[PDB]
Amino acid sequence: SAEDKAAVERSKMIDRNLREDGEKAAREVKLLLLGAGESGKSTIVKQMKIIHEAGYSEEECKQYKAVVYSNTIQSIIAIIRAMGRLKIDFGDAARADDARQLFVLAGAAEEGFMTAELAGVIKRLWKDSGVQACFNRSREYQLNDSAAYYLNDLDRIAQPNYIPTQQDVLRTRVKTTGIVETHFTFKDLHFKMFDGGVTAIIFCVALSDYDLMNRMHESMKLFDSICNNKWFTDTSIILFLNKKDLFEEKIKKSPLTICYPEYAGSNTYEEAAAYIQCQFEDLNKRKDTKEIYTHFTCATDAKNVQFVFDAVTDVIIKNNLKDCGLF
Ligand SMILES: Nc1nc2c(ncn2[C@@H]2O[C@H](COP(=O)(O)OP(=O)(O)O)[C@@H](O)[C@H]2O)c(=O)[nH]1
């Protein structure tokens, strides 16, 4: 900036002076990433690799090829299968053969793959109007949020010499079991980020889960437990209300009352998102002693993540540095 408060607070530290080569020491920030499955945790991890470190080499991208294929195959199959549950016919009754062929093809391979035959089967289904009506009713079943991303780019992805772009790798969903740890440097802070006691927590919420039980209420219960937990008294709690892009589109056609029956505001982006923010922040029992730092995010949008992470780093610099060691 110009006259940055964080840079000023930072310069008040004197602990480097107590080390022999102190200005070269590493200030460590430990970040714990939390939140329900599908809330964007692993996308944030990947954005940190892309924005602040190497991103993915082409060799790295080539390894993600069959993952892109597999994710695409999962997505269309999830949609076609929901057609059966929801009793939705195809636009063109000839797509029944394409649907059938999809299961034959998926059924006889071991891992994700792509051929012009498979791609044609999928374009025709994705294009179909009954399939699109089913896709548009996905709150009713379980559909990944990278589904439209890959299916709209099927031509590109299907080319014989396809190499996944970085946004393609970002958009993948990979089954991790156990704890994922990443390291990166930003603003001369050395971050250790842990993803299914500690400088800060980033708690992710899929805003777009409101109209799906009640996934949003499950997310609230987890945040209540975490925010009020005594282990985290001196931890900065940061709340990422994520998938704001998908939420912005859903709120036009789907009322918040589905998730909060008592809600009486307008069904608009600004009103509904403010309400959700208030519902989460009110689970803070230590309002007097503890603050929640809430940000609206689009985790698959690097410009937004960079901007938000920049603000988050300033909060840590101004508030937590006295608890971050040098190594
Ligand atoms: N449109 C959109 N998609 C997102 C956003 N954040 C995550 N996703 C996608 O939603 C899915 C779940 O995200 P992921 O990081 O794997 O969730 P995790 O289970 O918390 O690690 C993936 O398909 C992501 O590409 C977002 O802000 N907007």
How many angstroms does the Cα of residue 268 sit away from the middle of ligand 1? 23
Structure tokens at 317: 């610099």
DSSP bridge partners of 202: 33, 238
How many angstroms does the Cα of residue 43 sit away from the middle of ligand 1? 6
**Ligand 1 proximity of 199 Cβ (cutoff 6 Å):** no
How many angstroms does the Cα of residue 122 sit away from the middle of ligand 1? 23
Which mutation among 68, 300, 306 tests ligand 1's pocket best, with the greatest number of atoms within 8 A of CB? 300
Q: Check if 1-56+176-325 and 57-175 are the same fold.
A: no
Measured between alpha carbons, how far is 215 from 36 in angstroms, rounded to an integer? 9
The reported resolution of this PDB entry, expressed in Å, is 2.6
Ligand-binding annotation for 70, yes or no, is no
**Ligand 1 proximity of 243 Cβ (cutoff 6 Å):** yes
Measured between alpha carbons, how far is 129 from 250 in angstroms, rounded to an integer? 20
**Ligand 1 proximity of 314 Cβ (cutoff 6 Å):** no
**Ligand 1 proximity of 245 Cβ (cutoff 6 Å):** yes
**Ligand 1 proximity of 46 Cβ (cutoff 6 Å):** no
How many angstroms does the Cα of residue 114 sit away from the middle of ligand 1? 24
Q: List C-alpha distances in Å: 142 to 180, 208, 218, 269.
A: 25, 13, 16, 24
Burial category of 83 from C-beta neighbours within 10 Å (exposed 0-12, middle 13-18, buried 19 and up) = buried
Q: List C-alpha distances in Å: 43 to 173, 211, 243.
A: 9, 22, 11
Ligand-binding annotation for 274, yes or no, is no
User: Hey, is 31 helix, strand or coil?
Assistant: strand
User: Hey, is 27 helix, strand or coil?
Assistant: strand
Concatenated DSSP letters of 135-157:
HTTGGGS---TTHHHHHHTHHHH
φ/ψ of 240, rounded to 5, equals: -100, 105
Ligand-binding annotation for 32, yes or no, is no
Question: How many beta carbons lie within 10 A of that of residue 327, not counting itself?
Answer: 9
Question: How many beta carbons lie within 10 A of that of residue 162, not counting itself?
Answer: 16
Domain ranges of the chain: 1-56+176-325, 57-175
Q: Which of 150, 176, 152, 144 is nearest to 164 (CA)?
A: 150
Concatenated DSSP letters of 239-307:
EEEE-HHHHHHHTTTS-GGGT-TT--S-SSHHHHHHHHHHHHHTT-S-TTT--EEEEE--TT-HHHHHH
Which mutation among 38, 201, 203 tests ligand 1's pocket best, with the greatest number of atoms within 8 A of CB? 38
Q: How far, in whole angstroms, is CA 29 from its chain's centroid?
A: 21
Residue type, 169: V
Measured between alpha carbons, how far is 221 from 258 in angstroms, rounded to an integer? 18
Ligand-binding annotation for 299, yes or no, is yes
Record: fold of 57-175: GI Alpha 1, domain 2-like (1.10.400)
How many angstroms does the Cα of residue 307 sit away from the middle of ligand 1? 18
Burial 120-145 (b: 16+ CB within 10 A, else e): ebbebbbebebbeebbeebeeeebbb
Residue numbers after which the chain is interrupted (C to N above 2.5 A) read 195, 196, 212
* CATH H-level superfamily of 1-56+176-325: P-loop containing nucleotide triphosphate hydrolases (3.40.50.300)
How many angstroms does the Cα of residue 63 sit away from the middle of ligand 1? 20
User: Hey, is 109 helix, strand or coil?
Assistant: coil
Ligand-binding annotation for 145, yes or no, is yes
**Ligand 1 proximity of 65 Cβ (cutoff 6 Å):** no
Sign of the Cα pseudo-torsion (275, 142, 214, 288, in order)? negative
